[PDB]
Motif scaffolding. Structure first.
Motif, PDB file in Angstrom:
ATOM      1  N   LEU A 240     -29.511 -13.011   6.159  1.00  0.00           N
ATOM      2  CA  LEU A 240     -29.531 -11.793   6.953  1.00  0.00           C
ATOM      3  C   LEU A 240     -29.798 -10.576   6.079  1.00  0.00           C
ATOM      4  N   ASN A 241     -30.646  -9.678   6.586  1.00  0.00           N
ATOM      5  CA  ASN A 241     -30.864  -8.395   5.926  1.00  0.00           C
ATOM      6  C   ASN A 241     -29.619  -7.524   6.052  1.00  0.00           C
ATOM      7  N   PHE A 242     -29.160  -7.308   7.283  1.00  0.00           N
ATOM      8  CA  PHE A 242     -27.925  -6.572   7.521  1.00  0.00           C
ATOM      9  C   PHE A 242     -26.754  -7.301   6.873  1.00  0.00           C
ATOM     10  N   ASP A 243     -26.031  -6.604   6.002  1.00  0.00           N
ATOM     11  CA  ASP A 243     -24.967  -7.228   5.228  1.00  0.00           C
ATOM     12  C   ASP A 243     -23.689  -7.275   6.053  1.00  0.00           C
ATOM     13  N   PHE A 244     -23.179  -8.489   6.277  1.00  0.00           N
ATOM     14  CA  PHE A 244     -21.852  -8.691   6.847  1.00  0.00           C
ATOM     15  C   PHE A 244     -20.947  -9.472   5.901  1.00  0.00           C
ATOM     16  N   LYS A 245     -21.317  -9.549   4.617  1.00  0.00           N
ATOM     17  CA  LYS A 245     -20.466 -10.194   3.621  1.00  0.00           C
ATOM     18  C   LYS A 245     -19.094  -9.538   3.540  1.00  0.00           C
ATOM     19  N   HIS A 246     -19.009  -8.247   3.869  1.00  0.00           N
ATOM     20  CA  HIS A 246     -17.720  -7.574   3.951  1.00  0.00           C
ATOM     21  C   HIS A 246     -16.977  -7.933   5.232  1.00  0.00           C
ATOM     22  N   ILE A 247     -17.703  -8.247   6.305  1.00  0.00           N
ATOM     23  CA  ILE A 247     -17.064  -8.642   7.556  1.00  0.00           C
ATOM     24  C   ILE A 247     -16.534 -10.067   7.457  1.00  0.00           C
ATOM     25  N   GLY A 248     -17.381 -11.001   7.030  1.00  0.00           N
ATOM     26  CA  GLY A 248     -17.001 -12.398   6.959  1.00  0.00           C
ATOM     27  C   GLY A 248     -17.759 -13.267   7.940  1.00  0.00           C
ATOM     28  N   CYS A 249     -17.049 -14.162   8.628  1.00  0.00           N
ATOM     29  CA  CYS A 249     -17.672 -15.102   9.547  1.00  0.00           C
ATOM     30  C   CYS A 249     -17.119 -15.043  10.963  1.00  0.00           C
ATOM     31  N   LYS A 250     -16.055 -14.276  11.202  1.00  0.00           N
ATOM     32  CA  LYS A 250     -15.481 -14.153  12.537  1.00  0.00           C
ATOM     33  C   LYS A 250     -16.483 -13.527  13.499  1.00  0.00           C
ATOM     34  N   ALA A 251     -16.755 -14.225  14.604  1.00  0.00           N
ATOM     35  CA  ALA A 251     -17.787 -13.779  15.535  1.00  0.00           C
ATOM     36  C   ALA A 251     -17.383 -12.489  16.237  1.00  0.00           C
TER      37      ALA A 251
END
Length: 266
Positions: A240-251
């Motif tokens: 993914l271009n948009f970074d969600f590494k700070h969010i994680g995996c929770k939908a």
């Protein structure tokens, strides 16, 4: 009578009339035809399960006025006769997985579930886009090039669509995307998807959306944040271009994050 070595053809004797048989499981035998004389003998049949056998290809039309669930999965069928199911007006489920099917004939309008997977469909047949009440549909592991937009489908209770492992490029949702407002599962994993349409937020009742293993997919549109009922959103092998590494995996976190970016983004 399943998983026995029955074969190579079952011939029910016409002199026998069994009007109380409301199920018949001849699965995983070595049948090479449909059981003959099934209409005159087993008059009121509900579930005819012929899975796993080696059936070459149907030629005699079933006439079971009371059929409700047919199941011919894991067989050798390559083409169904153009009027083989016309005389069964109550069919709801029809499973024909793992065959060599290429065309689908005329079907009764009462068919609700229709699971044709892994069975060589180059394109979605025109006979299935006109089903009045088609709740569920599964066509995984075919070679599907383009699925039509919600304007082409005649049904209104579309509630689960499975199209993983297809050669799908552009998911089309531009025209009349509100017709799919009841869809509760849309799988498109392992395709060639390029960009999730911005109108995807109109499908306000999604509970799962599997767009995983789409390498060409780059970023999620903001408008996705309105799918408040989503609880599953697999992201495996999704660069993914948009970074969600700070969010994680929770939908739910992904959806809420997008929902805040709807209001304002700096």
């Amino acid at each position: 009578v399943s998983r026995n070595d029955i074969g190579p053809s079952v011939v029910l004797d016409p002199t026998v009339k069994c009007p109380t048989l409301k199920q018949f499981n001849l699965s995983y035998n070595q049948l090479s035809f449909v059981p003959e004389n099934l209409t005159d003998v087993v008059e009121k049949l509900e579930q005819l399960i012929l899975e796993g056998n080696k059936i070459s290809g149907i030629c005699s039309p079933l006439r079971l006025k009371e059929l409700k669930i047919l199941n011919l999965s894991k067989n050798h069928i390559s083409s169904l006769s153009e009027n083989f199911l016309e005389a069964c007006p109550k069919v709801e489920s029809f499973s024909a997985r793992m065959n060599f099917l290429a065309a689908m004939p005329f079907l009764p309008p009462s068919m609700t579930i229709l699971k044709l997977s892994q069975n060589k469909f180059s394109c979605i047949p025109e006979a299935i886009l006109n089903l009045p009440h088609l709740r569920s549909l599964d066509m995984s592991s075919n070679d599907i090039q383009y699925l039509p937009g919600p304007a082409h489908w005649k049904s209104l209770n579309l509630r689960e669509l499975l199209f993983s492992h297809n050669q799908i490029s552009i998911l089309d949702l531009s025209e009349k995307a509100y017709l799919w407002s009841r869809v509760e599962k849309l799988h498109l994993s392992h395709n060639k998807l390029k960009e999730i349409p911005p109108e995807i937020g109109c499908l306000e009742n999604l509970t799962s959306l599997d767009v995983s293993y789409n390498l060409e997919l780059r970023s999620f549109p903001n408008e996705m944040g309105k799918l408040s009922k989503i609880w599953d959103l697999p992201l495996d092998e999704l660069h993914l271009n948009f970074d969600f590494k700070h969010i994680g995996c929770k939908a739910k976190d992904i959806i809420r994050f997008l929902q805040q970016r709807l209001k304002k983004a700096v």
